Ligand binder design. Structure first.
Ligand SMILES: *C(=S)c1cc(C(=O)S)c[n+]([C@@H]2O[C@H](COP(=O)(O)O)[C@@H](O)[C@H]2O)c1
Ligand code: NI
Length: 425
């Protein structure tokens, strides 16, 4: 018996005893007893930065970037100390903007702003959303040597003091989330993101979970973020129960890399050899709201599935498939092969196509069985996955085609684990 992450509830699955490896879980590092007190200490003694109070001296306006609903950042724990420090430094609440770094996601709703930020903060401060398809809300900062133009939200570019908050987790394109990613793509225009999420970047072998050095995705969003600037970040790591296990604050690159150095010591979980069947999740609520995000559980399982093996994923999909643009791609391209022909041979850019490109990467290696009660089976069957009524049935089906020596690996927390093959085991 194992509980997979699944919406707000989890999902209790019973897996075959003689076939299943010990579940892959991150290492049990100690939660911080008092994370808010730790944030306070880190703002007074940051990495590679003057203390926040001293940075904020004389500043007339501030813009604080926060993640949208898809990241479970405990924002009030980070924001209350920042906002106290800005108040102490003399900035009026009217001089402070909280900007939701949607990337190209839909804007957050009023209720989502309350769940992300707490009612007190959502009712007191101006909280606005980034709109990546509105180029008029962005400022041009230059073009990188790779030819990517940097278009960044003007409210951030024009603020005297620039602050970004976030969460360091594995990411299927950028290696790890956090740090610089709040700027690119968090508040970058489609004119920037369509090229940075284009196939010339995403087909690179190191554009994958856990890779930073040598990953052109990470090299390029670090460069773009530095053309905008960021005076101060606060980033956290979370364990499986969503408790904070580390806080880093300070310089956007040095604090990020310190956070990554810690998370690398807990997120890796190894198997002795790749397996025929991998059971995984999409990390539950809030990540698993849409099929668009649930592709992350599929790419996360790739390193430990055998070529031609099967990934079984459970995801609640409470909000359905994803954006209208994403959904239109399934109608426009009934096969992944035709989709890939379209985007590889010409400069063809549709909002959200990058997650269809990641799904194509998955299906070149593995079959997918998808368990969800959030989208009807008829819809999922046109999304290049096989809907199956239950995880236990999906595993039994997969074990039938692979035979008596086939083994099952299970990753209850899905893409928040970095599964690896270690032959020395
Ligand atoms: C990572 S490539 C990324 C992509 C998008 C797209 O729409 S593309 C959006 N975001 C959002 O940006 C914020 C920072 O991302 P991080 O990966 O959590 O560091 C966050 O609000 C993401 O939802 C990221
Ligand atoms: Ni992105």
């Amino acid at each position: 018996r194992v509980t997979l992450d699944y919406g707000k509830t989890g999902l209790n699955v019973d897996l075959p005893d003689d076939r299943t490896l010990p579940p892959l879980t991150i290492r049990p590092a100690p939660p911080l007893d008092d994370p808010e007190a730790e944030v306070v200490r880190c703002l007074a003694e940051p990495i590679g930065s003057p203390p926040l109070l001293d940075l904020a001296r004389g500043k007339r306006s501030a813009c604080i970037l926060v993640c949208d609903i898809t990241r479970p950042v405990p924002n009030p724990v980070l924001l209350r100390p920042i906002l106290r420090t800005l108040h102490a430094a003399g900035l009026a609440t009217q001089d402070i903007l909280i900007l939701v770094a949607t990337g190209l996601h839909r804007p957050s709703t009023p209720a989502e702003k309350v769940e992300m930020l707490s009612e007190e903060i959502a009712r007191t401060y101006r909280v606005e959303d980034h709109y990546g398809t509105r180029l008029e809300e962005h400022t041009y900062l230059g073009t990188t040597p790779n030819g990517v133009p940097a278009w960044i939200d003007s409210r951030y570019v024009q603020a005297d003091l620039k602050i970004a908050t976030g969460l360091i987790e594995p990411h299927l394109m950028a290696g790890y989330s956090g740090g610089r990613k709040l700027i690119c793509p968090g508040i970058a225009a489609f004119e920037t993101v369509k090229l940075w999420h284009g196939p010339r970047f995403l087909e690179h072998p190191l554009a994958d979970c856990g890779f930073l050095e040598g990953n052109p995705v990470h090299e390029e969003n670090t460069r773009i973020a530095r053309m905008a600037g960021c005076d101060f970040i606060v980033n956290v790591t979370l364990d499986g129960a969503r408790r904070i296990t580390s806080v880093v604050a300070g310089d956007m690159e040095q604090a990020f890399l310190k956070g990554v150095a810690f998370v690398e010591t807990v997120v890796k979980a190894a198997v002795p050899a790749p397996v025929d069947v991998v059971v995984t999740s999409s990390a539950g609520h809030p990540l698993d709201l849409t099929f668009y995000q649930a592709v992350k559980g599929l790419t996360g399982a790739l390193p430990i599935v055998k070529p031609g093996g099967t990934i079984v994923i459970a995801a609640a999909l409470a909000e359905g498939l994803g954006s209208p643009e994403f959904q239109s791609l399934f109608e426009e391209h009934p096969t992944l092969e035709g989709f890939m022909e379209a985007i590889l041979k010409e400069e063809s850019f549709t909002v959200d196509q990058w997650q269809l490109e990641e799904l194509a990467k998955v299906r070149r290696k593995a079959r997918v069985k998808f368990v969800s009660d959030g989208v009807p089976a008829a819809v999922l069957s046109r999304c290049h996955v096989e809907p199956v009524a239950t995880v236990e049935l999906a595993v039994a089906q997969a074990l039938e085609q692979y035979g008596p020596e086939a083994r099952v690996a299970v990753i209850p927390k899905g893409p928040y684990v970095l599964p690896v093959v270690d032959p020395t085991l």
